[PDB]
Amino acid sequence: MLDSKLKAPVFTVRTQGREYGEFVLEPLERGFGVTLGNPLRRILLSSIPGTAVTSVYIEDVLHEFSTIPGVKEDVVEIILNLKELVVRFLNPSLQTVTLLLKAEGPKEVKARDFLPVADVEIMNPDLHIATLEEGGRLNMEVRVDRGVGYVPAEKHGIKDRINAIPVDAVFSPVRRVAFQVEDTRLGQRTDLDKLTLRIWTDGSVTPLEALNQAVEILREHLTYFSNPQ
Amino acid sequence: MLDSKLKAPVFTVRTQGREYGEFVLEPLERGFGVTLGNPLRRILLSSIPGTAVTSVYIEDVLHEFSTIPGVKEDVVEIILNLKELVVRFLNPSLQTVTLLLKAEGPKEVKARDFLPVADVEIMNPDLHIATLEEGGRLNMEVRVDRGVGYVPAEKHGIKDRINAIPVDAVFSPVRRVAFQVEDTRLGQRTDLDKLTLRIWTDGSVTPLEALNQAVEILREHLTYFSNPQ
Amino acid sequence: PAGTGSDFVRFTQVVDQKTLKAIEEARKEAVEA
Amino acid sequence: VRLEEGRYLSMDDVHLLIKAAEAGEIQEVPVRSPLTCQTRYGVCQKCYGYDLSMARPVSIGEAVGIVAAQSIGEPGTQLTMRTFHTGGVAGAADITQGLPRVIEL
Amino acid sequence: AEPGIDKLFGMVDSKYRLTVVVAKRAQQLLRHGFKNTVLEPEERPKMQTLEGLFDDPNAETWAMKELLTGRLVFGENLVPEDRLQKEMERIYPGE
Amino acid sequence: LSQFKDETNPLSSLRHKRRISALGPGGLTRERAGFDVRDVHRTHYGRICPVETPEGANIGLITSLAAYARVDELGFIRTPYRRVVGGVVTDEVVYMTATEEDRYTIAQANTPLEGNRIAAERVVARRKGEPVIVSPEEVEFMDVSPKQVFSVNTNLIPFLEHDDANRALMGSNMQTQAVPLIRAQAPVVMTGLEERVVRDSLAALYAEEDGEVAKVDGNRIVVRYEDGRLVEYPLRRFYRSNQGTALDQRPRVVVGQRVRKGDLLADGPASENGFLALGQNVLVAIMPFDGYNFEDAIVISEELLKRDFYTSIHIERYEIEARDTKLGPERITRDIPHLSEAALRDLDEEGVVRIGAEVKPGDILVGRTSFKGESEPTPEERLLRSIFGEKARDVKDTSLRVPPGEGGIVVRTVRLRRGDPGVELKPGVREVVRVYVAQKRKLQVGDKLANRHGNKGVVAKILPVEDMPHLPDGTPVDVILNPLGVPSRMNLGQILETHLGLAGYFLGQRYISPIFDGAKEPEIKELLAQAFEVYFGKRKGEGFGVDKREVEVLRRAEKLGLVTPGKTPEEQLKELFLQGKVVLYDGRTGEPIEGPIVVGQMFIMKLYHMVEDKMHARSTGPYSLITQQPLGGKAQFGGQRFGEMEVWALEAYGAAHTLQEMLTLKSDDIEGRNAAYEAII
Amino acid sequence: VVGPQLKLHQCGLPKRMALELFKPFLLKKMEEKGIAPNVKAARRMLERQRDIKDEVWDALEEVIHGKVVLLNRAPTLHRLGIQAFQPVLVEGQSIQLHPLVCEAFNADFDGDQMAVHVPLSSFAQAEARIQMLSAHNLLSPASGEPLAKPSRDIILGLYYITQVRKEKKGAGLEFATPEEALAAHERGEVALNAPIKVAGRETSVGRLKYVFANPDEALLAVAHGIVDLQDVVTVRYMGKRLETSPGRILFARIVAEAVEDEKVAWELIQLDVPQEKNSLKDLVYQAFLRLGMEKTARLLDALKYYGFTFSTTSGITIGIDDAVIPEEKKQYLEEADRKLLQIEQAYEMGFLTDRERYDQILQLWTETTEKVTQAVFKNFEENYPFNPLYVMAQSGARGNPQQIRQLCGLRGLMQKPSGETFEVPVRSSFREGLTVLEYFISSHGARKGGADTALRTADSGYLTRKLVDVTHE
Ligand SMILES: [Mg+2]
Ligand SMILES: [Mg+2]
Ligand SMILES: [Mg+2]
Ligand SMILES: [Mg+2]
Ligand SMILES: [Mg+2]
Ligand SMILES: [Mg+2]
Ligand SMILES: [Mg+2]
Ligand SMILES: [Mg+2]
Ligand SMILES: [Mg+2]
Ligand SMILES: [Mg+2]
Ligand SMILES: [Mg+2]
Ligand SMILES: [Mg+2]
Ligand SMILES: [Mg+2]
Ligand SMILES: [Mg+2]
Ligand SMILES: [Mg+2]
Ligand SMILES: [Mg+2]
Ligand SMILES: [Mg+2]
Ligand SMILES: [Mg+2]
Ligand SMILES: [Mg+2]
Ligand SMILES: [Mg+2]
Ligand SMILES: [Mg+2]
Ligand SMILES: [Mg+2]
Ligand SMILES: [Mg+2]
Ligand SMILES: [Mg+2]
Ligand SMILES: [Mg+2]
Ligand SMILES: [Mg+2]
Ligand SMILES: [Mg+2]
Ligand SMILES: [Mg+2]
Ligand SMILES: [Mg+2]
Ligand SMILES: [Mg+2]
Ligand SMILES: [Mg+2]
Ligand SMILES: [Mg+2]
Ligand SMILES: [Mg+2]
Ligand SMILES: [Mg+2]
Ligand SMILES: [Mg+2]
Ligand SMILES: [Mg+2]
Ligand SMILES: [Mg+2]
Ligand SMILES: [Mg+2]
Ligand SMILES: [Mg+2]
Ligand SMILES: [Mg+2]
Ligand SMILES: [Mg+2]
Ligand SMILES: [Mg+2]
Ligand SMILES: [Mg+2]
Ligand SMILES: [Mg+2]
Ligand SMILES: [Mg+2]
Ligand SMILES: [Mg+2]
Ligand SMILES: [Mg+2]
Ligand SMILES: [Mg+2]
Ligand SMILES: [Mg+2]
Ligand SMILES: [Mg+2]
Ligand SMILES: [Mg+2]
Ligand SMILES: [Mg+2]
Ligand SMILES: [Mg+2]
Ligand SMILES: [Mg+2]
Ligand SMILES: [Mg+2]
Ligand SMILES: [Mg+2]
Ligand SMILES: [Mg+2]
Ligand SMILES: [Mg+2]
Ligand SMILES: [Mg+2]
Ligand SMILES: [Mg+2]
Ligand SMILES: [Mg+2]
Ligand SMILES: [Mg+2]
Ligand SMILES: [Mg+2]
Ligand SMILES: [Mg+2]
Ligand SMILES: [Mg+2]
Ligand SMILES: [Mg+2]
Ligand SMILES: [Mg+2]
Ligand SMILES: [Mg+2]
Ligand SMILES: [Mg+2]
Ligand SMILES: [Mg+2]
Ligand SMILES: [Mg+2]
Ligand SMILES: [Mg+2]
Ligand SMILES: [Mg+2]
Ligand SMILES: [Mg+2]
Ligand SMILES: [Mg+2]
Ligand SMILES: [Mg+2]
Ligand SMILES: [Mg+2]
Ligand SMILES: [Mg+2]
Ligand SMILES: [Mg+2]
Ligand SMILES: [Mg+2]
Ligand SMILES: [Mg+2]
Ligand SMILES: [Mg+2]
Ligand SMILES: [Mg+2]
Ligand SMILES: [Mg+2]
Ligand SMILES: [Mg+2]
Ligand SMILES: [Mg+2]
Ligand SMILES: [Mg+2]
Ligand SMILES: [Mg+2]
Ligand SMILES: [Mg+2]
Ligand SMILES: [Mg+2]
Ligand SMILES: [Mg+2]
Ligand SMILES: [Mg+2]
Ligand SMILES: [Mg+2]
Ligand SMILES: [Mg+2]
Ligand SMILES: [Mg+2]
Ligand SMILES: [Mg+2]
Ligand SMILES: [Mg+2]
Ligand SMILES: [Mg+2]
Ligand SMILES: [Mg+2]
Ligand SMILES: [Mg+2]
Ligand SMILES: [Mg+2]
Ligand SMILES: [Mg+2]
Ligand SMILES: [Mg+2]
Ligand SMILES: [Mg+2]
Ligand SMILES: [Mg+2]
Ligand SMILES: [Mg+2]
Ligand SMILES: [Mg+2]
Ligand SMILES: [Mg+2]
Ligand SMILES: [Mg+2]
Ligand SMILES: [Mg+2]
Ligand SMILES: [Mg+2]
Ligand SMILES: [Mg+2]
Ligand SMILES: [Mg+2]
Ligand SMILES: [Mg+2]
Ligand SMILES: [Mg+2]
Ligand SMILES: [Mg+2]
Ligand SMILES: [Mg+2]
Ligand SMILES: [Mg+2]
Ligand SMILES: [Mg+2]
Ligand SMILES: [Mg+2]
Ligand SMILES: [Mg+2]
Ligand SMILES: [Mg+2]
Ligand SMILES: [Mg+2]
Ligand SMILES: [Mg+2]
Ligand SMILES: [Mg+2]
Ligand SMILES: [Mg+2]
Ligand SMILES: [Mg+2]
Ligand SMILES: [Mg+2]
Ligand SMILES: [Mg+2]
Ligand SMILES: [Mg+2]
Ligand SMILES: [Zn+2]
């Protein structure tokens, strides 16, 4: 092709790591960059499946409002940092993975201290979880699932071990979406939308990935305009 | 299918006359009805290519603000009724068609008075253009093009004949879009978007048609995210 | 004694064209022998 | 126009009359009212008027008594309250304003 | 709002009278069996879990749907107080 | 004269401690007088906050004294005043009596000073009660600072100066209702007392004399003073405040740290870093939504809940007694006579409920068995028992159940049986059972939040971050405040706070603006100017310019009168930003909101939930002995009160029967309610 | 808590509360269904939260169908203090009320708690939803005036949309006669002189550039960014070449649509001005008398809707640069200032009595004060027709003249404890620093105001009592 069609969007990309991901695409007809960036943004913040802590079990702790000796942090401040942790499985076979951890003595248990698990990777190694002092026992099991959106610990109420405690599920791997529609000058006319959205991600998935998934959800949805009635 | 997928959008339809066309579709996840109705609306008002008067030339009239003897109507009100006229070509070969008309003596020149043009049809036969009296000469040439959205006569400024006058371009066969997102309840969860958009059309195309075209333009656009660079 | 408690409306009966004939029939029966 | 006797004057009518008085044709208005009912412990239709919660005529069996006392109780909260039998004995404090007076009244 | 409330208000000499009729109507529309209606065949009362309102959801929503039509008859003294409840039970089954 | 210590949080406590009242003995002021007393008298300067009084029937009668206010030798509220001999002011101060004050010509703090020298010929001063423009030669005394004019509880308001004395009250009182959030956080803009507060109040734990830390336990911090000593400092983990708000001391000092004498070792229940913190700084758009923030409603970004922001830990305390009845002592056994084991589970410890057990409404907290009838059995119930199993614990189930509303996770229990160590078990009381329950209260629709300027609204809709207002750069707004609630009330202070906040956001900094001697519009405009560089600069460097929407709003902007026409979009936005507003995109459509909208960092608090918020709802229940009107108690809600005002309301309508039911079937008619119920069933 | 989408007709109540309230009615419905075998069963089934099958919610939701409840407010001052609505079960603790009736009950949402009762007898329910429902009692018993009218936000919305702008009037454009006045002044607009909305009697160039045939035509251009809703344009409606703004045109439709009787929609509406609370109020009253009760109800929500919607886009908020201070302030201040000196010289001599001096001073201020007030508005009315704060006040929306004054101009004379107003005024506005004393000074009259409400808040029925004891019969 050479004219109208060859003048197709030049989807260029610039991505560092698995977090930030810029996306540019132009030219575009009058006010389309908006018509696109917006829905996609809505999707990228709600639809996209992710992963996050859904249940925790501590050695001698029975409820979330307790305190563990030798451990500055309190159970609640810890289950909180866990929500911050970002994991990443590589295939469907992993619906629910339970990462194990057990540390003692003067040590700053970070997320890198979890025993490795085959198909699972941890994007949050140095993440702080607690500061143990002398005689500080800390043996725990933190469940991890693949879901979508926000699920209050009250809503699911996971049941691994009777003494375990449920945590709020934050699935959207996307941290924040953003899109700009700056005019672009191309020979003929000037009124040309130049969409370019910036995506942030916890690490679980990647910008590019997220975007792909997003656009699909849409496409698939557009398909629902098939059988009239 | 029975659960999640059978719970697919119940695209129902209600269309009376090629003009008005209601469209309902539910259930839908949190805030999607909006994510859908909005872009579609943007499309239905700009993309849906259409046709409409873009330039006019009168026998002895030079200025837009003149008056023609034997003709009650004034140049400004006549160029106005022209904007109301709806035409329809049948293939790409017709980008710009100039309909000719010449009527004299006591007659109510309607749109059916234009000399027929092979690849063109007039959906607006009985449209009132003027009421001619004794010694009323009326020889004109009105250009017609295929475009998208609204184009002020100031923006294009067509140049057929030096004495001709540009008219505001209204190609979009769509008269007005309107979508509502009223809550709907399906079992366990009540928060359910129920999108339902109402489409108006000049007659050229139909609601249903317009919608179909719209969703496609989007789909097609969603594909441009293919080859990176 | 003011609202629906008004001696004006306290007494008001409702009917069906069906029941209407039924009671006249009750009166028609009053004709002895 | 001929505003027939016994008719219920709509706001539209109260508008026509004010317009008439503007032109100069009337100064008073003969009208039924509660201050002259015959119905002892009652007040008939025609002497009351229009305003039910609706705009048509009053419907029979309505507790005008209370409906009145209320419509006047609510606004009461907006009036001023310095002293019930208003004014203070000093120099020459003449009238009484706000709720204090409405009491006195 | 509610169906032809105005239309209703007009069919009565007094606002408050209307409420008494529908009430009493809804009363007997249950007591003497719910199939004591003057309108049912084609388009009459309906609900959506299924079209199940055809049997017993809202009583008075029927009384009104009926009274809006010209089938019922309300008066101050139309039918002798006691002989009414007697004749209605004889003709309307459902218990 | 005495009541419950208002310790909803440290402040509440501190303010309550320093509160004055007229109501008392009987030889001193009663309830018949007041109109001249309840007025903020003239002498009420630096002696009594003019706004600290309550809101309602009790006004002027109960008031908390001003900051510097001090009761000398005998109940005469005095205030500080510096001596200014001749045109010379001194760093010396005299605590003057209310009476002696009349005797002199004092001037205000806000008077240009070159140190000891006064700076203007005509300078303000206030003789006994009146404002008078005096000469530097007559100025004998001067006011120490603005802060002495008001209370402690009021002096915390940022730009009080720009707030109607009437709404500032709402503010001052609002803070007393501040519930400590697990996520403390000091306001983006403070006044300068936050430190002194937590400190003078006993919020956080400070270090006595210099030294090093030895151990840092989640329960204790044994430090080592360089004097050769070492002491263990316990930390009240999760103790029960009179009002239910938690009070923990989270250490902020690491292992082996040389401490500076008087430096926080642990923070207070709600102290960020030795700074007071009673709400949470939160970005805010200030426009009208789809009626969701109607007259005083507020819309919340679900995102705020994603982060455990406005979550608050609450501890309730249930209690039940084993009473000694002449029909047989009430036994405290794990035996609940009539139906399931499923419901017995958590009751584990034969009787009491097990630790760490989630108790939902209805569940058993403690089992109790009293004796059935009043004195004789029941002939009807006798046949019934025999039928299936005559032999049965013919006893009643009067066990402590989770009251409607809610229950959390047990965290402690107390049992005081026979052989009491040294407790005071009331007569008849065989033994008492206390059970403490805790629940994490997250921000939910119906909860009420209020800034320090008096804007008090309730949450009306939690929106998904999905579609609520977002700035050009991704970041969405947390809360949306309707504007119609600001012209009427006259508190621009909040607007003045929002703006400065906008700066502090991209400038990543917190400020301090004293009462009457603080930040000023030009200075704010300045910092904003600095902010625009951070916000837009990076935008220029990251690779992009202005949107089509950004320019779109700009047009409707100049046509408005906000941006000087002609100048460049970049230059236009700067001006427009300096004004405190920026362009926001409707997260729902992607289009802009025609017209620059201000947004910023506004400190907002969560208000405590009184027991009334527990959505009451009674169907049927007990009834008083004497009068036969409904009554609630432990579990069953009390009946609502149907008073005359309402009676009339009904009377007005033609609601005849409806009114009778309220007087018969629903409350007093014995035979009625009974026949009623059944009839319905 | 406000229930925006809720309809007058209804109100949102927590299902949780519903359960308790309608327990008996629920129990029997349970037996009706397979949910429970009997009463005692159904009861135990509900005795514990965690033991309720979701089928029960579908049971309650079914029982409630049709029936309605009553709602009460803190002070029940008039009959409307109680209204009827159809419940719509909702999650949560809070109750969802409609905003329009928020006028009848004096209720804000800073925590005001309402109550609710249940009409049992088929009769009670009859009267309840017939003569006590909310959408049937629109007009007030006090004044025939509408009680349920576009309150605060809705107005603001409906107003912003229907309004016309005006701009710089450099060159003398009075096109009304020359054809060279059309050509040249049309180019000058395209230039940087004549604006789209200029003072040009017959028509500003803005009206010249655009001529819309059909109605819809008008709005599309707007949509396409060619025309703002508040700009002056020409359109061809039913047989008329009307020169009105898009916004106005649209409004016409909203009503013309709420009630399909389009022509009847133009006869009772005044699209010749911005929609004010009165304009609307009137609109409502007309709609009532003219069309019908229930139909009027529709138009009500219709307005409630667009009002809200437009409001959010309008983008009107409140920044510091909105409370504009008139330049004449310093003038009117200094003028009255020196005049105050005159009164002083006139006293220092012995001309005026100690009292004369006083009363004469206050006078001056009272005047000067009232002066700036008209001054600030004149500023807005002249320069910023669309100032946030100013729009809310003029429109029925929100904001009192005196109030505004306190912000831009200045709050001037506060009285002493007793009553004798101070001699010195409060020179400052809320826009700038209302200084310490100035503040303290204000604090005085603050207490008396509160001391006045308190002594009243005590007994609200005092007056109404006396009246009901002599009027009930
Ligand atoms: Mg590249
Ligand atoms: Mg996560
Ligand atoms: Mg272990
Ligand atoms: Mg702790
Ligand atoms: Mg696997
Ligand atoms: Mg696999
Ligand atoms: Mg180590
Ligand atoms: Mg390590
Ligand atoms: Mg990973
Ligand atoms: Mg250590
Ligand atoms: Mg388990
Ligand atoms: Mg971020
Ligand atoms: Mg081009
Ligand atoms: Mg452009
Ligand atoms: Mg991350
Ligand atoms: Mg892809
Ligand atoms: Mg169909
Ligand atoms: Mg939804
Ligand atoms: Mg000409
Ligand atoms: Mg002409
Ligand atoms: Mg002519
Ligand atoms: Mg014409
Ligand atoms: Mg074609
Ligand atoms: Mg061709
Ligand atoms: Mg073309
Ligand atoms: Mg709809
Ligand atoms: Mg459900
Ligand atoms: Mg539709
Ligand atoms: Mg079709
Ligand atoms: Mg079709
Ligand atoms: Mg009545
Ligand atoms: Mg017979
Ligand atoms: Mg016979
Ligand atoms: Mg007989
Ligand atoms: Mg016979
Ligand atoms: Mg008349
Ligand atoms: Mg005259
Ligand atoms: Mg009379
Ligand atoms: Mg009488
Ligand atoms: Mg009062
Ligand atoms: Mg008032
Ligand atoms: Mg109905
Ligand atoms: Mg009839
Ligand atoms: Mg029948
Ligand atoms: Mg049939
Ligand atoms: Mg079904
Ligand atoms: Mg079914
Ligand atoms: Mg069917
Ligand atoms: Mg009939
Ligand atoms: Mg008939
Ligand atoms: Mg008879
Ligand atoms: Mg019988
Ligand atoms: Mg018979
Ligand atoms: Mg307290
Ligand atoms: Mg005494
Ligand atoms: Mg006294
Ligand atoms: Mg008093
Ligand atoms: Mg004081
Ligand atoms: Mg002392
Ligand atoms: Mg003392
Ligand atoms: Mg000196
Ligand atoms: Mg000096
Ligand atoms: Mg000295
Ligand atoms: Mg004094
Ligand atoms: Mg001197
Ligand atoms: Mg004030
Ligand atoms: Mg100190
Ligand atoms: Mg200890
Ligand atoms: Mg320190
Ligand atoms: Mg903090
Ligand atoms: Mg902290
Ligand atoms: Mg809103
Ligand atoms: Mg619970
Ligand atoms: Mg006994
Ligand atoms: Mg012993
Ligand atoms: Mg105890
Ligand atoms: Mg609010
Ligand atoms: Mg700001
Ligand atoms: Mg300062
Ligand atoms: Mg200051
Ligand atoms: Mg400075
Ligand atoms: Mg500025
Ligand atoms: Mg967004
Ligand atoms: Mg914008
Ligand atoms: Mg009891
Ligand atoms: Mg009880
Ligand atoms: Mg209660
Ligand atoms: Mg019974
Ligand atoms: Mg069970
Ligand atoms: Mg349900
Ligand atoms: Mg029903
Ligand atoms: Mg209102
Ligand atoms: Mg009220
Ligand atoms: Mg209100
Ligand atoms: Mg409020
Ligand atoms: Mg309130
Ligand atoms: Mg009641
Ligand atoms: Mg209503
Ligand atoms: Mg509002
Ligand atoms: Mg001009
Ligand atoms: Mg001239
Ligand atoms: Mg001429
Ligand atoms: Mg020319
Ligand atoms: Mg020029
Ligand atoms: Mg130029
Ligand atoms: Mg003009
Ligand atoms: Mg244009
Ligand atoms: Mg114009
Ligand atoms: Mg017309
Ligand atoms: Mg429509
Ligand atoms: Mg119709
Ligand atoms: Mg219709
Ligand atoms: Mg019509
Ligand atoms: Mg019109
Ligand atoms: Mg300005
Ligand atoms: Mg502004
Ligand atoms: Mg001055
Ligand atoms: Mg004077
Ligand atoms: Mg001006
Ligand atoms: Mg001027
Ligand atoms: Mg001017
Ligand atoms: Mg004024
Ligand atoms: Mg006073
Ligand atoms: Mg002064
Ligand atoms: Mg001054
Ligand atoms: Mg000032
Ligand atoms: Mg000043
Ligand atoms: Mg100022
Ligand atoms: Mg100041
Ligand atoms: Mg009294
Ligand atoms: Zn009479």
Swiss-Prot record, chains A, B:
Keywords from the UniProt entry: DNA-directed RNA polymerase, Nucleotidyltransferase, Transcription, Transferase
Entry EC number(s): 2.7.7.6
BP GO annotations: DNA-templated transcription
Catalysed reactions listed for this entry: RNA(n) + a ribonucleoside 5'-triphosphate = RNA(n+1) + diphosphate
Coiled coil: none
Single GO molecular function: DNA binding
GO CC entries: cytoplasm; DNA-directed RNA polymerase complex
Family named by the database record: Belongs to the RNA polymerase alpha chain family.
Functional description taken from the UniProt entry: DNA-dependent RNA polymerase catalyzes the transcription of DNA into RNA using the four ribonucleoside triphosphates as substrates.
Free-text note regarding domains: The N-terminal domain is essential for RNAP assembly and basal transcription, whereas the C-terminal domain is involved in interaction with transcriptional regulators and with upstream promoter elements.
Quaternary organization: Homodimer. The RNAP catalytic core consists of 2 alpha, 1 beta, 1 beta' and 1 omega subunit. When a sigma factor is associated with the core the holoenzyme is formed, which can initiate transcription.
Protein name per UniProt: DNA-directed RNA polymerase subunit alpha
Organism whose genome encodes this protein: Thermus thermophilus
Lineage summary: Bacteria, Thermotogati, Deinococcota, Deinococci, Thermales
Gene it is expressed from: rpoA
Region of the whole protein represented: 1 to 229 of 315
Curated annotation (Swiss-Prot), chain F:
GO biological process, alphabetically ordered: DNA-templated transcription
Keyword terms: DNA-directed RNA polymerase, Nucleotidyltransferase, Transcription, Transferase
Catalytic activity: RNA(n) + a ribonucleoside 5'-triphosphate = RNA(n+1) + diphosphate
One MF annotation (Gene Ontology) recorded for this entry: ribonucleoside binding
Disulfide bond residue pairs: none
EC number: 2.7.7.6
Superkingdom, taxonomy of origin: Bacteria
Gene Ontology terms: cellular component: DNA-directed RNA polymerase complex
Family (UniProt): Belongs to the RNA polymerase beta chain family.
Subunit architecture: The RNAP catalytic core consists of 2 alpha, 1 beta, 1 beta' and 1 omega subunit. When a sigma factor is associated with the core the holoenzyme is formed, which can initiate transcription.
Function: DNA-dependent RNA polymerase catalyzes the transcription of DNA into RNA using the four ribonucleoside triphosphates as substrates.
Listed name of the protein: DNA-directed RNA polymerase subunit beta
Full-length numbering of the shown residues: 391 to 1071 of 1119
Swiss-Prot record, chain G:
Chain residues that bind Mg(2+): D108, D110, D112
Domain of life of the native organism: Bacteria
Residue ranges crossing the lipid bilayer per the database entry: none
Function recorded in the entry: DNA-dependent RNA polymerase catalyzes the transcription of DNA into RNA using the four ribonucleoside triphosphates as substrates.
Assembly, per entry: The RNAP catalytic core consists of 2 alpha, 1 beta, 1 beta' and 1 omega subunit. When a sigma factor is associated with the core the holoenzyme is formed, which can initiate transcription.
Record-stated family: Belongs to the RNA polymerase beta' chain family.
Protein name: DNA-directed RNA polymerase subunit beta'
Protein source organism: Thermus thermophilus (strain ATCC 27634 / DSM 579 / HB8)
Parent-record interval covered: 632 to 1104 of 1524
